[model samples]
Target: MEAIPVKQFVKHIGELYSNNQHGFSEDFEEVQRCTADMNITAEHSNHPENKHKNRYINILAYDHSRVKLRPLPSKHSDYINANYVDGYNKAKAYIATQGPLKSTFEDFWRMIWEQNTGIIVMITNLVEKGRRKCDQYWPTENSEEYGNIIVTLKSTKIHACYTVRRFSIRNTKVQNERVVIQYHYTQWPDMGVPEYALPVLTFVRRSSAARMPETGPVLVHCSAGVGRTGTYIVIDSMLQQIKDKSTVNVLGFLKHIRTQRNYLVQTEEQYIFIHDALLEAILGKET
Candidate 1:
């Protein structure tokens, strides 16, 4: 796996940008076509809010893993707004999802525990522009219990752009525990792309540097889990392609992912940002 140099990599992204000249409508339609074969149903999303939250962004059953909530009492929906995204190397290297709502907080933990998730990449804030984007799923200091699972914040490292928190999640019922690292990139604005890509790329590199178990998927979410979520995933995947193949096919990469989960790389701006971000990442290496 040889690395592509900065100039060549930047030129490759420019080529992708030049080739995809149709507007965002075409991009959306392309994603729509790719997802037409999957079963994305609301029958499993029990709560009204959950269903509403997923009104447009439905999880595809083709690759989605049902998050079995503990204390199963024959309820309607065992669904969480999440899906398994295959990585450049692993079959299920990442889980793309929306931020946890109050009702789905326990289910979130259950998924994390059951999946043995080692790292969580949260790209949205708890509250964005006076709107609650996500529930505070992690504990502050000591510990908090969500049904049978207990999460305690072991330590926290705050930076100018993002914060990293270490948490230990334990299932009291099974007496099993797993340490998880949560990386929150706070600089990303609501309904927009980041001003620069270096911070986001840095966070991705740091998260991957952990070298967490390959069996566990890295949990990644923003507000709706499509805009920034898709951008981050594409950037990571493109970087992997650069290492493994010495070239990149941005549209092809997005198509591959959108098959497993729909509407990845949400808008035209976000899709273009992937190019800018990847270019910045390559240029940064030269400096």
Candidate 2:
């Protein structure tokens, strides 16, 4: 593993945050028309969108213990299609589905403790299960209402458990100036990361606002939280309760990885593959 220079990370972020739709936008063609000015490099892919733009994807490598990307002022989705060759080759890892739950789950706990980030992990399944444990878990008109649903996590206090649906639903249930459904993406069936990731985002937000702790915690998970982690979270962030839609998406899926020694979302190809599937669903034929 090696450290990526600031310039390389910036290039990666540019690609990750691009609104070009995986290089299939009129803007991409315009970039080609102006390549002489922008020093743009594009390539072809078997994928339909790839045919549209020829560009170089920057790769950033870092230590095996933790992944950190140099700071770049861009969205996580911008660094699409990049690869973590050396890191993924050598690391303690798991597939997206059966990842290290203890580590990942505890990461949720750490995020909860931080007060700047206010995201929540929602356990819909948890709510259903908690209903079995406590009758008070059920949402009612009497419950604190946010929208179609009432955010009852404070009353239920289900944030202390493994299940997440309740928290996500509850946080988004109440809409206000401070609270907006900024992102929402369901997990792929293959990577059970969503099982925990979704709930963590939901519960984390609720717990923080009520001053329970854990705020400003960026919702993330295994495999760099970019491809698999990035896509799932971004989908929710972009399309969830918010009304505005931005064509901007994961630039190359690989943009989300942090190589610093602080976090480890293993860079498994499965996570990247799931990421591709996610993009197809977003810009694909209307279902």
Instruction: Please report, in order, the local distance difference test score of every candidate based on alpha carbons.
Output: 0.73, 0.29
lDDT of 1 at 166: 95
| Alpha-carbon RMSD of each model | 3.7, 17.9
Candidate 1 residues 110-222, lDDT tens each?
88988888899998899998988778888889899987789999999999888999999899989498888899988887766877778888887887666464547888888
- Once fitted onto the true fold, the runs of candidate 2 whose alpha carbons sit more than 4 angstroms away are 1-111, 122-215, 222-253, 260-268, 271-275, 284-287
Best by lDDT: 1
Error of 2 at 66 (Å): 9.2
Q: Count the backbone clashes (under 3 Å) in each candidate.
A: 0, 71
Q: After superposing candidate 1, which stretches have Cα over 4 Å from the reference?
A: 1-8, 15-33, 36-43, 46-73
